[PDB]
Amino acid sequence: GSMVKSGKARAHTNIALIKYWGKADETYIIPMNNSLSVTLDRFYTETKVTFDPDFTEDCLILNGNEVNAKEKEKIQNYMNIVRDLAGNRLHARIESENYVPTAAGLASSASAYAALAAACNEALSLNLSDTDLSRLARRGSGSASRSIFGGFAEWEKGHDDLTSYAHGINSNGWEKDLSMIFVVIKKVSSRSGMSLTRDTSRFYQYWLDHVDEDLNEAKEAVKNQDFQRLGEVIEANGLRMHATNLGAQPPFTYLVQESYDAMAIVEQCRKANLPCYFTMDAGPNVKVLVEKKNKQAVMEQFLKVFDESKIIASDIISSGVEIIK
Numbered sequence: 001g002s003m004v005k006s007g008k009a010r011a012h013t014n015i016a017l018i019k020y021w022g023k024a025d026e027t028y029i030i031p032m033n034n035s036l037s038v039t040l041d042r043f044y045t046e047t048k049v050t051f052d053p054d055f056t057e058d059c060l061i062l063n064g065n066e067v068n069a070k071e072k073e074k075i076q077n078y079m080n081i082v083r084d085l086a087g088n089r090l091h092a093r094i095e096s097e098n099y100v101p102t103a104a105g106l107a108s109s110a111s112a113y114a115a116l117a118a119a120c121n122e123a124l125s126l127n128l129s130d131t132d133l134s135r136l137a138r139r140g141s142g143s144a145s146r147s148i149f150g151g152f153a154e155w156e157k158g159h160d161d162l163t164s165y166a167h168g169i170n171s172n173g174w175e176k177d178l179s180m181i182f183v184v185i186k187k188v189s190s191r192s193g194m195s196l197t198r199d200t201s202r203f204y205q206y207w208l209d210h211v212d213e214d215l216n217e218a219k220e221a222v223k224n225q226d227f228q229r230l231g232e233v234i235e236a237n238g239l240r241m242h243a244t245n246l247g248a249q250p251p252f253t254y255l256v257q258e259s260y261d262a263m264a265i266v267e268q269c270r271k272a273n274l275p276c277y278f279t280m281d282a283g284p285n286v287k288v289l290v291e292k293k294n295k296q297a298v299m300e301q302f303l304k305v306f307d308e309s310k311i312i313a314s315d316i317i318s319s320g321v322e323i324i325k
């Protein structure tokens with residue numbers, strides 16, 4: 001198509017091992033602390049953008065279907081950022097597929113915005129650095145900043161739009177030895193929940209006082225390829241993030257009894273020499289970090305209690321966002 005510029009990208013979801021939770025800046029999505037994550041091989045979003053001078057506004061088609069006017073308006077504002085960045089006024093048709101178990105509660109924002117950013121950079125030929133790609137994705141969703149990268153990644157909080165972005169952490173191939181089990185188990189949205197907590201939680205300072213120590217400990221753990229050291233700090237970090245919500249005004253939780261059951265089975269696996277550690281995000285699902293060599297053994301412990309359909313593993317991918325057909 002002569003007057004038409006398109007680009008399609010595939011970006012993979014990532015789970016935070018050290019949590020992003022609370023913004024310093026609501027408009028530009030600058031976080032109150034750094035976060036560390038691992039990018040999952042099995043779950044991803046494919047997003048294609050097609051820019052046409054004769055397009056009157058941006059259109060979003062998701063999983064084969066028109067989105068409502070609310071999502072339409074939201075995506076148009078985001079694309080304004082893109083147009084501003086490219087110095088054009090081209091509108092786009094955006095066709096995205098989420099290969100993420102969203103019905104099952106898995107988040108799609110990270111992969112969604114990371115795929116969109118990359119797709120736009122490819123379509124418009126902006127030649128953005130990974131850094132600028134991460135920055136553009138961050139404007140859409142904080143955790144999207146990390147999905148530009150594979151393996152371990154860290155989002156550096158910074159102090160403004162220029163300085164807040166993620167980068168990949170080389171772990172000497174360690175990500176290749178690791179896996180994650182997902183225990184599948186309206187909700188307050190991540191953005192809304194973290195805002196209430198950051199603004200009002202009586203336990204939020206306590207979170208702030210320990211996160212840098214956690215991050216450093218975890219980073220040193222990764223350098224050492226020390227799984228136990230990594231798991232213990234990340235599990236504690238996770239629980240601390242949920243603690244902060246308990247302190248909110250008024251309190252709330254994302255966890256339910258079943259989540260706690262899942263946690264018990266992880267600790268059971270530890271005492272029985274199957275090392276693994278758990279984490280939870282903005283919902284009751286429990287994610288179990290385990291070494292690949294133990295994925296199966298640990299999975300079968302869970303399959304004693306939970307339906308087979310609700311136990312889902314993914315490996316950690318080494319490569320970052322990719323341009324596709």
Ligand SMILES: C[C@@](O)(CCOP(=O)(O)OP(=O)(O)O)CC(=O)O
Nearest residue numbers: 016019020141142143190191281282
């Ligand atoms: C619990 C978390 O998963 C929170 C993620 O929240 P979002 O990345 O969805 O927040 P927004 O920036 O408002 O889009 C922890 C994490 O990924 O660091």
